[PDB]
Amino acid sequence: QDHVEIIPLGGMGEIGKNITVFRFRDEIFVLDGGLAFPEEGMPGVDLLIPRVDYLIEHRHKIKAWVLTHGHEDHIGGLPFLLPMIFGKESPVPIYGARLTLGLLRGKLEEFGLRPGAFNLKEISPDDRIQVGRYFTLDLFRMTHSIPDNSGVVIRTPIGTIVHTGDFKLDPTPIDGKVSHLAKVAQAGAEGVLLLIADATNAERPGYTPSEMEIAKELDRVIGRAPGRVFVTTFASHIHRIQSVIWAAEKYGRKVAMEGRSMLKFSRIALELGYLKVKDRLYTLEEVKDLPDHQVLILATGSQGQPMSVLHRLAFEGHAKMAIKPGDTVILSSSPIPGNEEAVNRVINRLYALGAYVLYPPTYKVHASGHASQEELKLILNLTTPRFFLPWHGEVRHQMNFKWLAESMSRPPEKTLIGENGAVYRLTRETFEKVGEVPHGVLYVDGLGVGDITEEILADRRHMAEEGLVVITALAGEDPVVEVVSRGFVKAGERLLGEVRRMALEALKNGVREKKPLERIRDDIYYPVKKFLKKATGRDPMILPVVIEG
Amino acid sequence: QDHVEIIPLGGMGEIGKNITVFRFRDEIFVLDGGLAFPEEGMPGVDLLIPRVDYLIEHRHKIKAWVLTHGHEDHIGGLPFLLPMIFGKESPVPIYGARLTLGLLRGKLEEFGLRPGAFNLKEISPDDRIQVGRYFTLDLFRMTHSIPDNSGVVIRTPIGTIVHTGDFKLDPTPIDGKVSHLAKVAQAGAEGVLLLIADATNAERPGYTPSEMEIAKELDRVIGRAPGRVFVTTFASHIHRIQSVIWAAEKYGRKVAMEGRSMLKFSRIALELGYLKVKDRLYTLEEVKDLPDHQVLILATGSQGQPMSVLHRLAFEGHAKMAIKPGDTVILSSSPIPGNEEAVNRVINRLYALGAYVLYPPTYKVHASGHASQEELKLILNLTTPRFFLPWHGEVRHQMNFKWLAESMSRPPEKTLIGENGAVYRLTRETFEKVGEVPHGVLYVDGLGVGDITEEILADRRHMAEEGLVVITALAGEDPVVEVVSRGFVKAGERLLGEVRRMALEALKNGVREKKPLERIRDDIYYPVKKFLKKATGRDPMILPVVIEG
Ligand SMILES: O=c1ccn([C@@H]2O[C@H](COP(=O)(O)O)[C@@H](O)[C@H]2O)c(=O)[nH]1
Ligand SMILES: O=c1ccn([C@@H]2O[C@H](COP(=O)(O)O)[C@@H](O)[C@H]2O)c(=O)[nH]1
Ligand SMILES: [Zn+2]
Ligand SMILES: [Zn+2]
Ligand SMILES: [Zn+2]
Ligand SMILES: [Zn+2]
Numbered sequence A, B: 001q002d003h004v005e006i007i008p009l010g011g012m013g014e015i016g017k018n019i020t021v022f023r024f025r026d027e028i029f030v031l032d033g034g035l036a037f038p039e040e041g042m043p044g045v046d047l048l049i050p051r052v053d054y055l056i057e058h059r060h061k062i063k064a065w066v067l068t069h070g071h072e073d074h075i076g077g078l079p080f081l082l083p084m085i086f087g088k089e090s091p092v093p094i095y096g097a098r099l100t101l102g103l104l105r106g107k108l109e110e111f112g113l114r115p116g117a118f119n120l121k122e123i124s125p126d127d128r129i130q131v132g133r134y135f136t137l138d139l140f141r142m143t144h145s146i147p148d149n150s151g152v153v154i155r156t157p158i159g160t161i162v163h164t165g166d167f168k169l170d171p172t173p174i175d176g177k178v179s180h181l182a183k184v185a186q187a188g189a190e191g192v193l194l195l196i197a198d199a200t201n202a203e204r205p206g207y208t209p210s211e212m213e214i215a216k217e218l219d220r221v222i223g224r225a226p227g228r229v230f231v232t233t234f235a236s237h238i239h240r241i242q243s244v245i246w247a248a249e250k251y252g253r254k255v256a257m258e259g260r261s262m263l264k265f266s267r268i269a270l271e272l273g274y275l276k277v278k279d280r281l282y283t284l285e286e287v288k289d290l291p292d293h294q295v296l297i298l299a300t301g302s303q304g305q306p307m308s309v310l311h312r313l314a315f316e317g318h319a320k321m322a323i324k325p326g327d328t329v330i331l332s333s334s335p336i337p338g339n340e341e342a343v344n345r346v347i348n349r350l351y352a353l354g355a356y357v358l359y360p361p362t363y364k365v366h367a368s369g370h371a372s373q374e375e376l377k378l379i380l381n382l383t384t385p386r387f388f389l390p391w392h393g394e395v396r397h398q399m400n401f402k403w404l405a406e407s408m409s410r411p412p413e414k415t416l417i418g419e420n421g422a423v424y425r426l427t428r429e430t431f432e433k434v435g436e437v438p439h440g441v442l443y444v445d446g447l448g449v450g451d452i453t454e455e456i457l458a459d460r461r462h463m464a465e466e467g468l469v470v471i472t473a474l475a476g477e478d479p480v481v482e483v484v485s486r487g488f489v490k491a492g493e494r495l496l497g498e499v500r501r502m503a504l505e506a507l508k509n510g511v512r513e514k515k516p517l518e519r520i521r522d523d524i525y526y527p528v529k530k531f532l533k534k535a536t537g538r539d540p541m542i543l544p545v546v547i548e549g
Helices: A053-057 A078-086 A098-110 A182-190 A211-224 A238-250 A260-271 A307-314 A340-352 A373-383 A395-406 A454-466 A496-512 A517-536 B053-057 B078-086 B098-110 B182-190 B211-224 B238-250 B260-271 B307-314 B340-352 B373-383 B395-406 B454-466 B496-512 B517-536
Strands: A004-010 A019-024 A027-031 A047-050 A062-066 A093-097 A119-123 A128-131 A135-141 A150-156 A159-163 A194-198 A229-232 A254-258 A295-299 A328-331 A356-358 A387-391 A422-426 A431-436 A441-445 A448-452 A468-475 A480-486 A541-548 B004-010 B019-024 B027-031 B047-050 B062-066 B093-097 B119-123 B128-131 B135-141 B150-156 B159-163 B194-198 B229-232 B254-258 B295-299 B328-331 B356-358 B387-391 B422-426 B431-436 B441-445 B448-452 B468-475 B480-486 B541-548
Touching (some): A053 A078, A098 A260, A182 A373, A194 A373, A238 A295, A254 A260, A307 A340, A454 A541, A468 B468, B004 B053, B053 B078, B098 B119, B098 B260, B150 B182, B182 B373, B211 B238, B238 B295, B260 B295, B340 B356, B454 B541, B480 B496, B496 B541, B517 B541
Parallel strands (some): A062 A093, A254 A295, B229 B295
Antiparallel strands (some): A004 A019, A128 A135, A150 A159, A468 A480, B441 B448, B468 B480
16 A cells, blocks of 8 residues: 655756655655756756745655755755745755765855755765655765765665666776765665666766776876866866866966856865865966966856856857967866757867867767766666666666666566656556656746746747737727838748738727727737738747727 | 969858869869758758859859769759859859769759750769869769769869868778779879868767668668668668668568658669669558558658658658657768757657667767768878868868878878858968958748848847847827837846836937937837846847837
8 A cells, every 4th residue: 555656856858957756655855956057049047947836835744855966956956946945944854965065055155045044964975864754765875976976775665766866887986985886786685676777878888987087188188288278167076176186286287267156166175175286276367477388277157067158268258268379178078968069169169269179079088977888787787676767867868778777687577767747656566657746947047036937938939930020000090000020031021011901901890899909919910820821831929019099 | 373262152161051162263163062951940941052142243254063972062052053153044064973963953853944954964973074274173983971972183273182072981882882092192192282171070080880881780770670660861862771771671671752852862863773672662651551560761851851850750740650659760860060959859759759769879870971080091191282171071170180180291281271251372382361252151941042031040049039029109299108028038027117118208309309210219229228238137129119190
């Protein structure tokens, strides 16, 4: 009769804004609460966060919030999500490792969220915590692109759920902290009911290169740089940042840092001992008049991602720095899903500015923080789950992980492709989607959350693809109709006179018939809509503005 | 004193719409005239063609048009370009190999362009032709993704220009026709003044896989397909089409073909003997009630590219066919530059529809038709040019080819990164950009060329990114102002009342001052523009519609 309910609100069928709800009877615990960065073409938007209607409604049932690591797509939404769910304070335990909470506290500060306003509980990446009456969570350290990263064995009343968390099996991590697989292998031997695993590189054969390999390559290309060196990466990629710092130090270069979020995350990492710097980190101004060959700039965008700073350096221009011939620019991160070709344009432009650009995959200046097939198969054989739920990847990633699992010695009884908002029921003998709950995203820009909406976005697309047709109609005894367009096909642009004309007949009949301005609007809208369709095969946005006299 | 002028009008700093003008004194010859396929997000547009203002102006100076191969980005623009330059007929020699001209004639037919309306001169892929008094062109066969493909040694009064054309050095081509390098090596020993070479895969190490490797892999994955098989590729990829046909035949599958352009190109290839089919090619209807395992569908979009058919199969739906669980879909081509992540979405959706999708680079079901670094270095050492002009690739490709050349035994004296519209002057001792000429693109949709413009496109983007603010103003003794918006930030949406108000003051002052409706429009536009900027940091499109009384 007993069953666990798994409800993803973000992170399924996508890479970003991870948050997964677990529930047994009337006790809930949440795993992460990340944000997702926006794709280009969606200007204005700073970040996306998952809709948590379900948690707001069941807020009093949440017994704890568990955070796996400090990447923005795992804790970036919290400064927004917490207030939405609990208000400006809460007693609910929010567990996380030292670095993870250090970064979280840093973010909360920025939102005026008091320190102890929330109950942050610092734990070990390998800790064991009891959540309410029904959940015993056994965390285990996993190598990833940030220190203090964990997976978790979720022990429930009906069996074990092994959650790999974000991971790769780096044999030689920069901080010397290898993955701890004892709890995972142990659970495998005892019997794993459900496995939830990182599908990011499920389509990639072999093993993901070690962060140390990148460190060595960065060392090489940097020691080869004739003048200045610019390195872009995510602010939360502490391992990469350390690799860069070591490179800069070895060749006598002072490290300057640009990007609010990275200076912040880096300061915190230094205070807590996760980062070490021979000298100290400097600002752009402090290295202003340094010889080109003794300067290395670590930069990212205001929100933590490299895109915005790369784009400004290449196009609109940056107020604090400018690219010049001879400069070496290294993109030490992969593009946000959807920005791949936006990055290529940036690269093209950086080259045209005279810089020597090194970027992946052409140049080995970056390595994924996720496991490739050999690492995934190892985890699959370690756990031999009865049920499988690929996560942290789009449908193709999830599907390729499913195919990978199906080719193992003891394939899972059943594998499901998880979706955001879906409700999965897990029993000792079954696993199935049994419903859905309100889900989605909320858009965030400077002017707060929601300033941008799905509707606003929908109109922008209808606009961007079909154009606009504005019909100005004066409803009086001497009716007037003017039609103008923009971004509309020239062919249709020559049919506006016919538009104006049919709008006039509608306007006159509307008046003569004492109709309300709204039904007159409809009377104009629908006919012109159909006409331009049956005439140009286009669906421009038709804005009928009907004004009395 | 003598010098050759090279003027690219398309194909430089991009992959697509290739056309290059060569000139000595008053005699011109043109190399190709392709089109470029559109990126998604640029809906409505069917194809892009290069602006040929320069050739229209100097039309009487053109002594011949030379076509290297039948790929759309080399001959696809001709049905549009020829009429624009010569009218509906011309005596000017248009040289091309058998297949190349066969496909060209097929295209011209579709535009009502009479057969002999133009002077198509069929030549051998290894021919030698004299162009006017100053040019002797020595063509040489090069393996590529279509039969009858050539590079060309352009012999001029001041030296030799070796143009590689599109190529890879496939050691085992499907048609058994290997590359002919005798003319290239010969020119290298005599001394090559300028080398123009294919930079597509200049950033890729090693050698491009042979089309035969793909043929074998396609054979494997197809023989593994439980039910129907769908294969998408460009209509002009005759080698790939043959590879697929052989696969289908070996496993007793009848081949159906969808996509006007591919049925057409394939018929022509069959008539001319470039394609061989055990049985015959069928239509969708003819294979309607065939067992799933005995059906293979070769498809592409109406214009020759796979995108539109893949998109319909995955989203909006196709009238002639539908994807069903168990179907195997193979994307046997790479995405158009800018469609990479549009393809990923299609793949995700195809998987969600229940099909087994195989696509590159995850699956080896496709191989580039362009040379990788080892093939390029071979060509570089074969020619050892004094001057170098990488072509057929974006800036990063061009730059990486430049770096590759600079690492050779005898680097070029100087390498230039070519641009469309730039004018390069070549003498025996020099090579330099000395000017520019009107250049660009023209957008083409069903309603003909130009139906879509840069302006229309610009407004669509301004619209798509910033939204819209329509201010309706009635200029009379009882002024009226109404403001409405769409795709505009909620924050700004709350400032429309303030907009209306400042528009009213402008409207009233405009009236009271007898100003013309245009200066009143400006008086409303500019202030509101600045206001919303200084208030929301956004630049929405402001459409002030001022109407008398
Ligand atoms: O905080 C982060 C760090 C990385 N990524 C993205 O996750 C994907 C995998 O990163 P990786 O394989 O390069 O480590 C990429 O699309 C990258 O842009 C994020 O969305 N958020
Ligand atoms: O007629 C064609 C054939 C291929 N391509 C494109 O050329 C690039 C290289 O193709 P390939 O390396 O896969 O052969 C790709 O972006 C592909 O979409 C075209 O633009 N036109
Ligand atoms: Zn992560
Ligand atoms: Zn993650
Ligand atoms: Zn080609
Ligand atoms: Zn080409």
